[PDB]
Amino acid sequence: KDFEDAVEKAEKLVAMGGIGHTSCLYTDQDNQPARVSYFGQKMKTARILINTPASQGGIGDLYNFKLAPSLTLGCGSWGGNSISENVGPKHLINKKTVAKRAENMLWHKLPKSIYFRRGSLPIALDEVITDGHKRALIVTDRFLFNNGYADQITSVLKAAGVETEVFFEVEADPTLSIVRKGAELANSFKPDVIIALGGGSPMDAAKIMWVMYEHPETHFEELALRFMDIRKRIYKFPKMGVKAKMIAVTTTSGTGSEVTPFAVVTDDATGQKYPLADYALTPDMAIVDANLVMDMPKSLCAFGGLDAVTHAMEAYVSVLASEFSDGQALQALKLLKEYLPASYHEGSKNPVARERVHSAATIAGIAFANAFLGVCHSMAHKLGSQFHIPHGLANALLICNVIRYNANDNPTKQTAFSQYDRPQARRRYAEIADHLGLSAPGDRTAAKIEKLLAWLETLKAELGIPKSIREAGVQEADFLANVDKLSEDAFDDQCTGANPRYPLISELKQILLDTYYGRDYVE
Amino acid sequence: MVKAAYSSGKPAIGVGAGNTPVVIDETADIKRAVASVLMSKTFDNGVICA
Amino acid sequence: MAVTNVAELNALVERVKKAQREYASFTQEQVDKIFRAAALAAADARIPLAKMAVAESGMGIVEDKVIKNHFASEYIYNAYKDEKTCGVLSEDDTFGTITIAEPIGIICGIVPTTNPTSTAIFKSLISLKTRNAIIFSPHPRAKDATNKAADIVLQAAIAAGAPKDLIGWIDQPSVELSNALMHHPDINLILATGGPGMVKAAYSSGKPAIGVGAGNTPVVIDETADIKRAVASVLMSKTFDNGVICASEQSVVVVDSVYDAVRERFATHGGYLLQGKELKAVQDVILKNGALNAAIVGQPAYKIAELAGFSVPENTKILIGEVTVVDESEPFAHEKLSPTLAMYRAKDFEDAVEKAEKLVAMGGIGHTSCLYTDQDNQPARVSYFGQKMKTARILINTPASQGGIGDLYNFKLAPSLTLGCGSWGGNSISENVGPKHLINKKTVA
Amino acid sequence: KRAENMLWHKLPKSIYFRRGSLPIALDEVITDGHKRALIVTDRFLFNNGY
Amino acid sequence: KSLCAFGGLDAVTHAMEAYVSVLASEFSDGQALQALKLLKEYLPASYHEGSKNPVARERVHSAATIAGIAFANAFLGVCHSMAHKLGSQFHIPHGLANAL
Ligand SMILES: NC(=O)c1ccc[n+]([C@@H]2O[C@H](COP(=O)([O-])OP(=O)(O)OC[C@H]3O[C@@H](n4cnc5c(N)ncnc54)[C@H](O)[C@@H]3O)[C@@H](O)[C@H]2O)c1
Ligand SMILES: NC(=O)c1ccc[n+]([C@@H]2O[C@H](COP(=O)([O-])OP(=O)(O)OC[C@H]3O[C@@H](n4cnc5c(N)ncnc54)[C@H](O)[C@@H]3O)[C@@H](O)[C@H]2O)c1
Ligand SMILES: NC(=O)c1ccc[n+]([C@@H]2O[C@H](COP(=O)([O-])OP(=O)(O)OC[C@H]3O[C@@H](n4cnc5c(N)ncnc54)[C@H](O)[C@@H]3O)[C@@H](O)[C@H]2O)c1
Ligand SMILES: [Zn+2]
Ligand SMILES: [Zn+2]
């Protein structure tokens, strides 16, 4: 009685004899394009013939010139076949492939402008004035707002005629609860530039509230998913910068978060530190000036400067370490060898040493933005979030054992990478020990690692660092009850995938036990 | 035969039988649709598949 | 819910057949929502699924099943992220052809015991990508790890928009319950991975079956190779999950020009060269009754020597036996599924390929070979090796465990954990199985 | 008092490099919505398939 | 071979003038010295061999860009000022002019 009833009767006529062989349809194929697609969607055959005699049109190269000519017409898995096509010579081939080795594409991604000198805070802030920005949001710490550090930015900004607003309610660790508070302030103010004034946690909380202001429907449970490789991850970060730029003014001289695509934020429901890593979190401008670093106390200068040593030391031995980030990893260790003892003792009376340490933390930030950290920062994120040890103190205790852990000739379960030839972390640790001049002109490879370990054993001695985690204020009844949970949490903290060794969970608790009791790790 | 060709343990490329339901709606060419059915169904007295 | 015998098995397939025919009418847009959310929660549970598969079977390293469950959930998502499999694939206006994709239907899924949870992630993701269902029948040794792995993908898909019962699994397998599933009248495909006794059974039921076989991996290291690369890549891939992976390096063939330098590079590192009494003490522990015993499959290298009757150091990783004959009488020329090697010596490069041609004769006819040489300065040897070896994939300067599966070291092989061998080994694919093998392309001429 | 001139470190937004990363980097400019491209080459590089 | 020797010696002068310049800061001193370390060890190897030592032809192609990181932010000295005039007057190719 209708066209749509005729296809219904035809669907029951391919039910009795032959499930997916061949149907046919006669209509004007030019004036009716909606009926030739409804008939192709309903009929469960292998070939759909239109205005064609089915004997000459079922076989190929007649009336169509695009079907493959054959006299054995397949029906697919509807009729119990495995072709669903016309059988030709391409079904009897057994294709054999020869796959040669290729290397993973590396990169060197930085902010668009890294401005740095002694007093280049207002000269760099005049660039964001002339770019047409009229509404700015400034994310600071609570200490920096009460000490006039946030007033050095608002005085230059409001003198040119922009609308500023200061969010000064971040903590030492940027939990997720104080991020959605600033993201609620963001879309109620609608800024055009987010200035992340601060050293660590004020910058990591500003990068995530840059996401939730740009795309307010993103889930934190999908940002914190651990990938195996970037450019092949499941949750792609959306393209940001469509209504808000990011300026990154740093104050502490230990963390290069102004150039790295990292944002370590706490979940605040289970108490876990999650390093969120994708290159959409890179700021558009990093301002590293040493006028904000002069009045830094001695406890923050020693915690920061020893953290930036471990930044350039793990980015040099990593598997993603190429020739582009080996010069910056060694330059940041040359400056931190000569000036970090001078910047701690002399403090603010020796400004030319406080400036070089503040630059060497950012140069180390160039290194591990493109060649990520190893297993020392994977354990330091869990050790710092469990017992409230500040970041910079945690990885300073751990670095002397990870160097003895990674420097092995035949390690158990070396990692998989196409660029990484063999386990060669012991040679690259010896290339540091003579670039810094720590070695005599005649030495073996195993003797240069001892002079490297003896250097940062005295460097932590004259900087007020304790010898163990027990001397840092951790009870043995509390540490030994969580040393199995922290050894499994550090296995999947997304910095594990760049270590030269792929660590076992039994080996990661051996480093944590030998660092609490003050021993040295021996396999 | 398709049930027997896939019953021996070996990779098999089998094909089956089949009907061919034809739909001739109201906007078709009646002089083409009738003369093409008579040509293809009498082709070798309809021993051809499809 | 549970399935233990044939009376409620037919109630499981009839539940799946009802819920698949309303999933077969989905669009391209609302399948990519399901396929993304299923892979998003399958990589989230890479840690607990890896600890269950070692607690159940006890034949692997827990740290290696993490990056195998991660490979089966984010590399399978990345290659088939935007691939047309549901609606109109192509269309020609000058020739007048429309190519429409379809589903196949219910698929019998047969997982092995070596990869009990990673293939359950892989076969589930490529099934609901092509809008069809799958019924799992796990190995009885590791039945609880597979049924838990398919449950995380199912409960994440229903929250995304899938039907109520799309992925089913046999809760308690048997040799009769699995045979009753393969002879069911309303399933259409058998995705079956296992040994050579299973491929003969998967192609014996009257149904189109996509089977894969086992296989050796003869390695040819000629005189112009990188010795520091070739030794360090064999140790990485053979100790990857203690060699339970298909296409792991079961035997190497070194030329006589660099045979001594390769042995010294193996001896100073984690390899242990077996000498004299220890060589014969391990040849009677691998072949039990003319077949590979299940007591050494996936065990570490110090437990195989402990089962043989001596003691190696606890940190040794590869048991090397220098053998001479290429035959079925030598037990070291077989597939071992354990960190154990077999070093052969050849007098030339063209003699090393001849010994490698006889090493793909015993176990696995067309699975995987390998070759270590400089692929730029020697283009005539990479074409002579590709013409002589009758395998499905030829790996050059590549660890065979990470290089047999795709998207690692090559970026052009299709990533899959079911590696075909072609009609040499009694298969019908000769490729890596992806979502393009479960389509049933329909043309409109 | 003496002050110092503001220095900088300005680079391209992405510096992709390895042995064969020409088509893997060209897939980024495909997904950015670019539909019309102009390629400025030398006369030798056009006649030699580059 | 004529283009490999003209180019690789040009990139030596790129990293050597960007290291002694007055705009040379601590950010572009590591990249200026890294590009001279790679051009010392592989540029004789990349000229003699060529495509028979690809791992040496790759490091020279990377060391020219690492030197490009150096003089993008700390500009060249007086050697390239004379080489632009010496090369445009007598048609000496760039790379040969600043090498002399
Ligand atoms: N972005 C990254 O890639 C990255 C890398 C490492 C660590 N982090 C995160 O950052 C945190 C470390 O940050 P941090 O310790 O460098 O800074 P911080 O935010 O921890 O600052 C420490 C405290 O000192 C005060 N302070 C900050 N700057 C000061 C100054 N100039 N003068 C006087 N007092 C000052 C602040 O009030 C603050 O409470 C870690 O918790 C870690 O999670 C991020
Ligand atoms: N689409 C196509 O490719 C195509 C083409 C022509 C015919 N056909 C089908 O074939 C039929 C034509 O009659 P037919 O006599 O060729 O069909 P048939 O099934 O009787 O085929 C007979 C041939 O198949 C083999 N055979 C039959 N039963 C067998 C068994 N149990 N075990 C092993 N071998 C067996 C015999 O060797 C015999 O020569 C039609 O009904 C049609 O559906 C299909
Ligand atoms: N081709 C590949 O990519 C690949 C991948 C992994 C493993 N494999 C092969 O599989 C083996 C892994 O060990 P395994 O114990 O799984 O091998 P196996 O042959 O014992 O296979 C076990 C599975 O096959 C099924 N099976 C076994 N015998 C059967 C029969 N008679 N009828 C129906 N089903 C049957 C069972 O359901 C079981 O889950 C290796 O030896 C390897 O060669 C191949
Ligand atoms: Zn740090
Ligand atoms: Zn020049």
Backbone dihedral region for residue C263 (phi beyond 0: left; psi -120 to 50: alpha; all else: beta): alpha
Gap between the Cα atoms of E26 and A364, Å rounded: 12
C246 labelled catalytic: yes
The per-residue DSSP string of B1-50 comes to -HHHHTTSSS-----------EEE-TTS-HHHHHHHHHHHHSGGGGTS--
Q: Which residues of B touch C423 (CB under 8 A)?
A: 11
- Count CA within 13 A, CB hemisphere, residue A97: 19
DSSP 3-state of C221: strand
Is residue A197 a contact partner of residue A138, using CB atoms and an 8 Å limit? Answer: yes
User: Known binder of ligand: residue D42?
Assistant: yes
Gap between the Cα atoms of C356 and C369, Å rounded: 8
Gap between the Cα atoms of D7 and A114, Å rounded: 8
Is residue A371 a contact partner of residue A498, using CB atoms and an 8 Å limit? Answer: yes
The angle formed by the CA atoms of residues A30, A33 and A34, to the nearest 5 degrees, is 155
Binding site residue list of E? 10, 14, 80, 94
The angle formed by the CA atoms of residues A411, A414 and A418, to the nearest 5 degrees, is 145
Torsion sign, CA atoms A359, A362, A363, A364? positive
A158 token code pair = 């409001």
> Which residue has a Cα nearest atom 6 of ligand 1?
A255
Nearest CA-CA distance, residue A195 and chain D, Å: 18
- CA-closest candidate to residue C442, choices A48, A35, A15: A48
Touching subunits for chain C (3+ Cβ pairs under 8 A): A, B, E
- Placement of tokens 């070739």 in the chain: C230
For residue A49, what are the β-bridge partners? A24
> Which residue has a Cα nearest atom 38 of ligand 1?
A172
A122 token code pair = 């207002």
Gap between the Cα atoms of C18 and C12, Å rounded: 10
Gap between the Cα atoms of C21 and C3, Å rounded: 22
Could you tell me if B11 lies within 8 Å of chain C, comparing CB atoms? yes
Q: Which residues of E touch C377 (CB under 8 A)?
A: 52
The angle formed by the CA atoms of residues C1, C7 and C10, to the nearest 5 degrees, is 75
Q: Ligand 3 test: best mutation among C57, C114, C249, most atoms within 8 Å of CB?
A: C114
Q: Cα(A111) to centroid of ligand 5, in Å?
A: 26
Which one-letter amino acid corresponds to residue C244?
V
Torsion sign, CA atoms A36, A40, A41, A42? positive
Q: What CATH code would you report for C6-212?
A: 3.40.605.10
* H/E run at residue A289: strand A285-289
Q: How far is CA E99 from CA A116, E10, E76, in A?
A: 33, 6, 14
Q: Which residues of A touch C402 (CB under 8 A)?
A: 416
Length of chain D equals 50
Q: Cα(C139) to centroid of ligand 3, in Å?
A: 8
Q: Ligand 1 test: best mutation among A391, A393, A399, most atoms within 8 Å of CB?
A: A391
Q: Which residues of A touch C399 (CB under 8 A)?
A: 416
The angle formed by the CA atoms of residues E95, E98 and E99, to the nearest 5 degrees, is 75
> Which residue of B16, B20, B41 is in closest CB contact with A80?
B16
Gap between the Cα atoms of A122 and A117, Å rounded: 11
Instruction: List the strands of the sheet with A193-196, edge to edge.
Output: A114-117, A285-289, A245-249, A193-196, A135-141, A163-170
Q: How far is CA C346 from CA A480, C113, C257, C320, in A?
A: 56, 35, 9, 17
C252 token code pair = 């190497």
- Enumerate the active-site residues of B: 49
CB contact under 8 A, B7 and C208: no
- CA-closest candidate to residue C270, choices C217, C322, C319: C319
Q: B1 in ligand 2 pocket by Cβ < 6 Å?
A: yes
Which one-letter amino acid corresponds to residue A156?
V
Ion ligand 4, residues whose Cβ is below 5 A away: A 307
For residue C211, what are the β-bridge partners? C192
> Cβ atoms within 10 A of the Cβ of A232, count?
17
| Orientation angle between helical segments A327-338 and A425-435, nearest 10 degrees | 50
For residue A26, what are the β-bridge partners? B24
Nearest CA-CA distance, residue C334 and chain A, Å: 23
Gap between the Cα atoms of C319 and C341, Å rounded: 6
Which one-letter amino acid corresponds to residue A392?
G
Closest ligand to Cα A314: 4
Nearest CA-CA distance, residue D37 and chain A, Å: 21
Torsion sign, CA atoms C41, C44, C45, C46? positive
Domain boundaries, chain C: 6-212, 218-404
Q: Cα(A127) to centroid of ligand 1, in Å?
A: 26
Q: Which residues of E touch D8 (CB under 8 A)?
A: 73
Gap between the Cα atoms of A26 and A6, Å rounded: 12
Catalytic residue among C86, C108, C246, C370: C246
Is residue A50 a contact partner of residue C445, using CB atoms and an 8 Å limit? Answer: yes
Q: Cα(A173) to centroid of ligand 1, in Å?
A: 8
Contacts of A348 (CB under 8 A, 6+ apart): A294, A295, A354
DSSP 3-state of A337: helix
Gap between the Cα atoms of A428 and A314, Å rounded: 11
Nearest CA-CA distance, residue E22 and chain C, Å: 44
Could you tell me if A330 lies within 8 Å of chain E, comparing CB atoms? yes
What CATH number does domain C218-404 carry, 3.90.870.10, 3.40.50.9100, 1.10.760.10, 3.40.309.10? 3.40.309.10
Closest ligand to Cα A19: 2
- CA-closest candidate to residue C34, choices C149, C100, C178, C133: C133
Touching subunits for chain D (3+ Cβ pairs under 8 A): A, E
Nearest CA-CA distance, residue A491 and chain C, Å: 9
CB contact under 8 A, D8 and E73: yes
Q: Which residues of A touch E33 (CB under 8 A)?
A: 327, 331
Which one-letter amino acid corresponds to residue C51?
K
C422 token code pair = 């072609």
Q: How far is CA C218 from CA A303, A339, C205, C292, C320, in A?
A: 54, 56, 33, 18, 14
Gap between the Cα atoms of A170 and A183, Å rounded: 12
Q: Cα(A170) to centroid of ligand 1, in Å?
A: 11
- CA-closest candidate to residue C127, choices C42, C246, C5: C42
Q: What is the DSSP letter of C374?
A: -
Using the atom order of ligand 1, give the atom closest to the CA of residue A263: 1
> What is the gyration radius of the CA atoms in chain C, in angstroms?
23
Q: What is the resolution of this structure in A?
A: 3.5
> Which residue has a Cα nearest atom 41 of ligand 2?
B17
Using the atom order of ligand 3, give the atom closest to the CA of residue C215: 43
Gap between the Cα atoms of E89 and A377, Å rounded: 57
Is residue A477 a contact partner of residue A465, using CB atoms and an 8 Å limit? Answer: no
A45 token code pair = 């055959």
Q: What is the DSSP letter of A106?
A: B
Nearest CA in chain A to E23: A117
Q: Which residues of A touch B17 (CB under 8 A)?
A: 17-18, 21
Gap between the Cα atoms of C176 and C182, Å rounded: 10
CB contact under 8 A, C188 and A77: yes
Gap between the Cα atoms of A114 and A395, Å rounded: 27
Using the atom order of ligand 1, give the atom closest to the CA of residue A203: 1
Long-range contacts of range A155-159, CB-CB < 8 Å, 24 or more positions apart? A156/A121, A156/A122, A156/A125, A156/A126, A157/A125, A157/A129
Q: B4 in ligand 2 pocket by Cβ < 6 Å?
A: yes
Is residue A197 a contact partner of residue A149, using CB atoms and an 8 Å limit? Answer: yes
Which one-letter amino acid corresponds to residue E86?
L
Is residue A24 a contact partner of residue B41, using CB atoms and an 8 Å limit? Answer: no
Q: Cα(B1) to centroid of ligand 2, in Å?
A: 6
Q: B47 in ligand 2 pocket by Cβ < 6 Å?
A: no
> Which residue has a Cα nearest atom 4 of ligand 3?
C246
Gap between the Cα atoms of C404 and C217, Å rounded: 10
Closest ligand to Cα A168: 1
> Cβ atoms within 10 A of the Cβ of E1, count?
9
- CA-closest candidate to residue E77, choices E23, E5, E11: E23
Could you tell me if C379 lies within 8 Å of chain E, comparing CB atoms? no
**CB burial readout A249-258, b (16+ within 10 A) else e:** bbbbbbbbbb
Nearest CA in chain E to A335: E26
Contacts of A289 (CB under 8 A, 6+ apart): A115, A116, A117, A118, A119, A120, A121, A124, A249
